[PDB]
Copies of this chain bind each other. A is one copy, B any other.
Amino acid sequence: QQLTPAQQAALRNQQAMAANLQARQIVLQQSYPVIQQVETQTFDPANRSVFDVTPANVGIVKGFLVKVTAAITNNHATEAVALTDFGPANLVQRVIYYDPDNQRHTETSGWHLHFVNTAKQGAPFLSSMVTDSPIKYGDVMNVIDAPATIAAGATGELTMYYWVPLAYSETDLTGAVLANVPQSKQRLKLEFANNNTAFAAVGANPLEAIYQGAGAADCEFEEISYTVYQSYLDQLPVGQNGYILPLIDLSTLYNLENSAQAGLTPNVDFVVQYANLYRYLSTIAVFDNGGSFNAGTDINYLSQRTANFSDTRKLDPKTWAAQTRRRIATDFPKGVYYCDNRDKPIYTLQYGNVGFVVNPKTVNQNARLLMGYEYFTSRTELVNA
């Protein structure tokens, strides 16, 4: 019945998809998950702030849990400093991962990675929820913690955790990587905060800082420590040809990346086009209004729009926030906007160019949108019809 090149390829993917899923299911059922420490180091960022960690080459790697602790001292004679909106999420400035073939996966900021960790959890990442329980549950272990203020002459202790994903989730191995069978070494690069990035003076932009206040100039880290734990699957199932492996899962990249866009003007639609071919699962837009971060009051509306000028969700800021409250049970910090496209990823070539839109009500000097994306990127095929 004269199936076309398109039809045949499609057909030979439907079987590919099924084979992949089955392989994934078998790997998950037969292998056993392991999480083990890879490396720990304690240092003063005044000495060194960039570290290249070398993960162990074993089985299928799903991701890394990075524990970061720090001690900060405010030696100002009289003034305190207070946490910025991102606070300890800025202990790590940037994270970059390269697999055994030296293919780069995620490359983004600590704050963006943290917001995605929260979005994926459905609540502030590793937080302790407050309840009326008389039994003493609560913030017992201070998993993620930082003092609200550090007074002149005081030293505060902070703890922060980041999950650097390779696999999309515990059950979806899309994006996972791969030492079964040796052979191909990296790299998990961690770029930490230092005295220059962590402390912002009054009036300075707090975006990348941990603390801001009149005592900023005299604040110093005493030390930072990190411990990287690698999560992977061991005892990979073997069948007939060798390892039973989800080939599509392992040849797909699940990455986070961020960028900055400028050119905003009052009451005009600022459109950030989605960079085609990627399957965008989520989008985070931070309106850094010249160092000011506002709770929606500087925005008329936000939206996702496709090439016909047709908006799929043009919403006022509070209604946009309402959708996010359904996703993470609370609001992201001032000026941070989130958009979930997990079930139907934004994918140009499926419906023309798409763009993320912000129509600002007020635009200060040096205003810009910091965009954070979560996406899958796959093998691209072209056909002759």
Where the two chains meet, the residues of A that have a C-beta atom closer than 8 Å to any C-beta of B are 1-5, 29-30, 32-43, 46-48, 50, 52, 56-59, 65, 67, 83, 85-89, 96, 98, 100, 102-104, 107, 114, 118, 121, 123-146, 148, 158-159, 161, 179-185, 187, 208, 227, 229, 234-235, 259-269, 275, 295-296, 307-319, 321-322, 325-326, 328-334, 344, 349-353, 363, 366, 368, 370, 377, 381-385
Contacts and interface: CB of A to CB of B under 8 A. Distances in A.
Nearest to A270: B260
| Number of identical monomers bound together in the oligomeric complex | 3
A214 B40 CA distance: 31
Contacts of A126: 322, 325-326
A143 B333 contact: no
A42 B334 CA distance: 27
Given A127-B132, A308-B382, 4 more contacts: A137-B331, A141-B318, A263-B263, A309-B383
A121 B295 contact: no
Given A134-B145, A318-B67, A2 B333 contact: no
A295 B141 CA distance: 6
16 contacts: A4-B235, A40-B50, A41-B47, A65-B322, A98-B310, A102-B234, A121-B326, A125-B133, A137-B331, A140-B331, A141-B296, A143-B321, A159-B318, A265-B368, A307-B385, A308-B382
A159 to B, nearest CB: 7
Contact of A143 (B86, B331, B332): B331
B118 A134 contact: no
B40 A329 contact: no
Contacts of A124: 131, 133, 135, 137
Contacts of A50: 39-40
Given A50-B40, A65-B319, A319-B65, A135 B30 contact: no
Contacts of A104: 308-310
Given A5-B30, A107-B310, A227-B316, A329 B65 contact: no
A303 to B, nearest CB: 10
A263 B260 CA distance: 10
Given A87-B134, A128-B132, A161 B322 contact: yes
Nearest to A131: B127
Nearest to A231: B313
A136 to B, nearest CB: 4
A150 to B, nearest CB: 12
A263 B67 CA distance: 31
Nearest to A158: B134
Nearest to A334: B140
Contacts of A102: 58-59, 234-235, 309
Contact of A181 (B59, B184, B266, B318): B184
Contacts of A40: 48, 50
A329 B123 contact: yes
A273 to B, nearest CB: 11
Nearest to A26: B5
Contacts of A130: 129-132
A295 B140 contact: yes
Given A41-B47, A56-B52, A114 B135 contact: yes
B136 A132 contact: no
Contact of A185 (B56, B262, B326): B56
